[PDB]
Amino acid sequence: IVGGSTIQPERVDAAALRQLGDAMRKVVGSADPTPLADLLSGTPVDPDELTREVGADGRQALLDSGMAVDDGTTFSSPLRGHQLHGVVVLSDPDVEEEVQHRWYVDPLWEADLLIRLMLRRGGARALDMGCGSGVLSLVLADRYESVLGVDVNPRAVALSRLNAALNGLTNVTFREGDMFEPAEGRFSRIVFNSPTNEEGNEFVDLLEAGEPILETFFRNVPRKLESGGIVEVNLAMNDYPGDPFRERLADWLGLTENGLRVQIFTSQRRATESGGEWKRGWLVVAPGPVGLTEVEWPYHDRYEED
Ligand SMILES: Nc1ncnc2c1ncn2[C@@H]1O[C@H](CSCC[C@H](N)C(=O)O)[C@@H](O)[C@H]1O
Ligand SMILES: [Mg+2]
């Protein structure tokens, strides 16, 4: 019911998308919403009021791309608008599991926090693994000569492309595929907002895919990373008695043997019902002395207070 809508940015001229992006930038996230802001916050709107804001071409572009649907008397949108860090982003509305389509796209739960954690440097070539709405890809595109975003969710790939087009971004490409498979060559920069939470080792769905997706990611990251390259991962970690996450991580990465420096910043923590520990934190691979370090950083709390 939510997250299966058809998204078709190829059905609309790039200039028309950029223009809609321009209008969105004026109103999405700001007080006293116009019909376009209303549309993109889930409120059905009168088509004629919309026309005056985006033009009859804009109206058609909204329809052709899947951004709006004609309920006869009113238009409504399956998507919701965000504006943040210089970028306008459409994604699915935040709703509960029971009403989520299998292709439901991350409604930007942690996006804004993660952007603020990311190192400020830019560079040659960036990869955004599991790109979702494309939000992180869009932000990286300002700093990096080109950006590739990858997702196994084909609808996320469409959404990302639409979002790139709305912002008039030229240097960002998206590909459908499984993990690193459609990502050819090596990268200066790799970001992974990983689909892990409380599911332990078990695949539940594309937003809670289990620890094996992290294993696949980190085993393959050495061969995908330019020397001196940076990796940033948002993830959940499960420590089991006699079996801490970091030693599995060390084995996956071939840490000593590939000469990587890794830092795990742990933000949240709770005892598990087996004497182990669940953690949430932020993992950084960056140039420097080979080895693994764990540091405390309660950035969730700090983000909440400021
Ligand atoms: N095997 C796989 N290969 C590529 N992407 C995958 C994948 N399994 C899950 N994903 C994707 O990983 C994403 C995690 S949510 C993060 C989305 C976006 N980067 C953001 O920060 O908002 C989801 O979009 C999910 O579809
Ligand atoms: Mg789920």
Candidates 117, 207, 215, 221: which one to mutate for ligand 1, based on the most atoms within 8 Å of Cβ? 207
Residues 65 and 135 in one domain: no
The answer to whether 179 is a known ligand-binding residue is yes
Residues 97 and 234 in one domain: no
Look at the chain and count its residues: 306
Other C-beta atoms lying within 10 Å of the C-beta of residue 163: 31
Domain count, the chain: 2
Residues 215 and 113 in one domain: yes
d(CA 245, CA 249): 6
**What proportions of the chain, in percent to the nearest 5, are helix, strand and coil?**
35, 30, 35
Nearest CA to ligand 1 atom 24: 132
Ligand 1 neighbour 183 (Cβ under 6 A): no
Nearest alpha carbon to residue 153 among 125, 183, 174, 127: 174
Residues 188 and 61 in one domain: no
Which residue segment(s) compose the domain that 75 sits in?
A: 1-105+153-169
Ligand 1 neighbour 195 (Cβ under 6 A): yes
d(CA 19, CA 74): 22
Strand locations in the chain, DSSP E? 69-70, 75-76, 80-84, 87-91, 123-129, 144-151, 172-176, 187-193, 225-239, 261-271, 277-286, 291-296
Method for structure elucidation: X-ray
Residues 49 and 162 in one domain: yes
What does this entry list as its resolution, in Å? 2.2
Residues 197 and 274 in one domain: yes
Tokens of 188: 């200066």
Residues 137 and 160 in one domain: no
